[PDB]
């Protein structure tokens, strides 16, 4: 929601959703680009964190 | 509500860390993670009994058995392989034995 | 010999909950190449790239598709859009000057119709005909196609390998599963006859009483022959001549991806080198790395 | 009797242990096992009594 002087305010679920969509996006961008699995593995463990 | 497809199926944490998935599969919780974290393969369906099912196989010995059996064996690594471990077994049959 | 410092220590890893020390565990195992590994494999990357460019040079329609698209844009009387970037583009080994795509374009007509009569006359695998199809492969690899439009011309066979193979699969899923034909004899006829319905009763001629009860699907087996031969009827190019492009392009492609696994993993920690000079808390330690890869 | 229960015998395995606890996970080499214990109780810039 907007606070007063241009500053805003967010719950902790907004940003924690952002770290899952991008990892569900970067993993999408790796598979088509014929990536090495050592990249595809380290993408997968960041989603497991996320 | 919104919904996202996941690229690979990933495990739920409240049925991992609590244990409900090792106790369900006869495996330690520490001996699950090495299969999840892309360190060690696990036997999906061993038609050949040289490796018994549910085995923590390093990448070194991974080449050793591959040349022996080719494609006649089954071994994957990751949290979709643990979906494949949960997929294989039978509820009522494995309840019959206990 | 660096696998044991993993496997005698990944047997004893300190219940490691951090995934960076899993990734940094692996990326230090590949040994770094100096001053020549980035050169002789830069050949091998490029060698397999232009191995494909000889095997896509064989498909007689793929050259003419490029022309028939070039026949469209320049004859629309006004075209300097983003198409003319991705086209033919012969490189000197660019604004496409409309004087030089005409005087350097006469040869793709004299290499077109001459390369028709000699393969028509007295042999298509003919040796004297071969050295004009060998001459056709000269004037096309200097026509270095931009990879935006080139991947389509590679993809034009990939959809035809499958359309062959699914029409191979539509013989195996429709007969072998149900009528119980043992496959040790069908592999004699794929190079045996492979043209028309002369093999169809020939496997019935081997009596074998599963082969008698075959009057319900009489309109169902060689029907699928006429549509796999529609690939023959649309191309005019024989089936193992497809399978000498399907087996000749992959080796150029299984050289490329195989070599890039060497060109990437020897240099994985140069990616982490710059990855800590923008390490300010925008995303993560790892979200820059997997972006940097 | 403390030397009874010890796994190691010299410096080249002592810096192994200081590596194999203070930095878990990582496959230990020589200088990274030297340069750690150098810097924990003998570094100027990272220690001051």
From Swiss-Prot, chain B:
According to its UniProt record, how is this protein modified after translation?
Acetylated on several lysine residues in the presence of glucose.
Q: How is it used?
A: Co-administration of salinamide and rifampicin or salinamide and myxopyronin suppresses the emergence of resistance to both antibiotics.
Q: Name the coiled-coil region(s).
A: none
> Quaternary structure per UniProt?
The RNAP catalytic core consists of 2 alpha, 1 beta, 1 beta' and 1 omega subunit. When a sigma factor is associated with the core the holoenzyme is formed, which can initiate transcription. The rRNA transcription and antitermination complex (rrnTAC) consists of RNAP, NusA, NusB, NusE (rpsJ), NusG, SubB, ribosomal protein S4, DNA and precursor rRNA; S4 is more flexible than other subunits.
The UniProt entry's sequence similarity note says: Belongs to the RNA polymerase beta' chain family.
The record describes the protein's role as:
DNA-dependent RNA polymerase (RNAP) catalyzes the transcription of DNA into RNA using the four ribonucleoside triphosphates as substrates. Resistance to the antibiotics salinamide A, salinamide B, rifampicin, streptolydigin, CBR703, myxopyronin, and lipiarmycin can result from mutations in this protein.
Q: What is this protein called?
A: DNA-directed RNA polymerase subunit beta'
Q: Which residues of the full protein are shown?
A: 102 to 201 of 1407
Curated annotation (Swiss-Prot), chain C:
Q: According to its UniProt record, where is this protein located?
A: Cytoplasm
Residue ranges annotated as motif Interaction with polymerase core subunit RpoC: 287-290
Domain of life of the source: Bacteria
Q: What is known of its domains?
A: Contains 4 domains, connected by flexible linkers. In the active conformation, the domains are in an extended conformation, each making extensive interactions with the RNA polymerase catalytic core.
Summarize the protein's role: Sigma factors are initiation factors that promote the attachment of RNA polymerase to specific initiation sites and are then released. This sigma factor is the primary sigma factor during exponential growth. Preferentially transcribes genes associated with fast growth, such as ribosomal operons, other protein-synthesis related genes, rRNA- and tRNA-encoding genes and prfB.
Protein family according to the UniProt entry: Belongs to the sigma-70 factor family. RpoD/SigA subfamily.
Q: How does it assemble?
A: Interacts transiently with the RNA polymerase catalytic core formed by RpoA, RpoB, RpoC and RpoZ (2 alpha, 1 beta, 1 beta' and 1 omega subunit) to form the RNA polymerase holoenzyme that can initiate transcription. Identified in a complex containing RpoD, the RNA polymerase subunits RpoA, RpoB and RpoZ, CRP and DNA. Interacts with Rsd; this prevents interaction with the RNA polymerase catalytic core and with promoter DNA, and as a consequence, promotes transcription from promoters that require alternative sigma factors. (Microbial infection) Interacts with Escherichia phage lambda antitermination protein Q.
Protein name per its UniProtKB record: RNA polymerase sigma factor RpoD
User: Which source organism does the UniProt entry give?
Assistant: Escherichia coli (strain K12)
From Swiss-Prot, chain D:
Entry similarity comment: Belongs to the RNA polymerase beta chain family.
Subunit annotation: The RNAP catalytic core consists of 2 alpha, 1 beta, 1 beta' and 1 omega subunit. When a sigma factor is associated with the core the holoenzyme is formed, which can initiate transcription. The rRNA transcription and antitermination complex (rrnTAC) consists of RNAP, NusA, NusB, NusE (rpsJ), NusG, SubB, ribosomal protein S4, DNA and precursor rRNA; S4 is more flexible than other subunits. In pull-down experiments interacts with CedA. (Microbial infection) Interacts (via flap domain) with Escherichia phage lambda antitermination protein Q; this interaction renders bacterial RNAP resistant to transcription pausing and allows it to read through termination signals.
**Biotech utility:** Co-administration of salinamide and rifampicin or salinamide and myxopyronin suppresses the emergence of resistance to both antibiotics.
Q: Per its UniProt entry, which superkingdom is the organism in?
A: Bacteria
UniProt-recorded name of the protein? DNA-directed RNA polymerase subunit beta
Q: What does this protein do?
A: DNA-dependent RNA polymerase (RNAP) catalyzes the transcription of DNA into RNA using the four ribonucleoside triphosphates as substrates.
Protein modification: Acetylated on several lysine residues in the presence of glucose.
């Amino acid at each position: 929601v907007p606070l007063d002087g241009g500053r805003f305010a967010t719950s902790d679920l907004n940003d924690l959703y952002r770290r899952v969509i991008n990892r569900n996006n970067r993993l999408k961008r790796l598979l088509d680009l014929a990536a090495p699995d050592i990249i595809v593995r380290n993408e997968k463990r960041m989603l497991q964190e996320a | 509500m919104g919904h996202i497809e996941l690229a690979s199926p990933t495990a739920h944490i409240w049925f991992l860390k609590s244990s409900r998935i090792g106790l369900l599969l006869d495996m330690p919780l520490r001996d699950i993670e090495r299969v999840l974290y892309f360190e060690s393969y696990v036997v999906i369906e061993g038609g050949m009994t040289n490796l018994e099912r549910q085995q923590i196989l390093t990448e070194e010995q991974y080449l050793d058995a591959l040349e022996e059996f080719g494609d006649e064996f089954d071994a994957k690594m990751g949290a979709e392989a643990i979906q494949a471990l949960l997929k294989s077994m039978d509820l009522e049959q494995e309840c019959e034995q206990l | 010999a660096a696998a044991q410092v993993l496997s005698s220590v990944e047997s004893e890893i300190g219940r490691t909950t951090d995934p960076v020390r899993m990734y940094m565990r692996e990326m230090g195992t590949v040994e770094l190449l100096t001053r020549e590994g980035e050169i002789d494999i830069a050949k091998r990357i490029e060698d397999g790239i232009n191995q494909v460019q000889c095997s896509v040079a064989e498909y007689p329609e793929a050259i003419t598709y490029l022309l028939e698209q070039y026949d469209r844009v320049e004859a629309e009387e006004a075209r300097l859009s983003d198409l003319i970037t991705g086209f033919v583009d012969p490189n000197a080994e660019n604004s496409i000057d409309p004087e030089l795509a005409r005087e350097k374009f006469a040869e793709l007509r004299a290499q077109y119709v001459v390369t028709r009569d000699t393969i028509k006359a007295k042999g298509r695998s003919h040796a004297t005909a071969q050295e004009e199809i060998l001459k056709l492969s000269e004037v096309f690899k200097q026509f270095r196609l931009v990879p935006k439009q080139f991947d389509y011309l590679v993809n034009s066979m990939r959809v035809m390998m499958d359309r062959v193979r699914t029409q191979e699969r539509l013989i195996m899923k429709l007969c072998v599963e149900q009528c119980k034909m043992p496959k040790k004899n069908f592999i004699t006829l794929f190079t045996g006859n492979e043209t028309s319905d002369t093999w169809f009763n020939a496997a019935i001629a081997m009596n074998k009483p599963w082969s008698e009860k075959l009057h319900d699907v009489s309109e169902e087996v060689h029907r699928a022959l006429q549509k796999l031969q529609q690939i023959e009827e649309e191309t005019g190019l024989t089936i193992e001549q497809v399978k000498d492009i399907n087996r000749r392009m992959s080796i150029g492609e299984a050289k490329a991806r195989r070599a890039k696994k060497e060109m990437v993993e020897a240099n994985l920690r140069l990616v982490i080198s710059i990855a800590k000079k923008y390490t300010n808390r925008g995303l993560q330690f790892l979200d820059l790395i997997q972006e940097g890869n | 009797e403390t030397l009874r229960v010890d796994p190691t015998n010299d410096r080249l395995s002592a810096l192994v242990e200081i590596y194999r606890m203070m930095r878990p996970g990582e496959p230990p080499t020589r200088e990274a096992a030297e340069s750690l214990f150098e810097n924990l109780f003998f570094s100027e810039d990272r220690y001051d009594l």
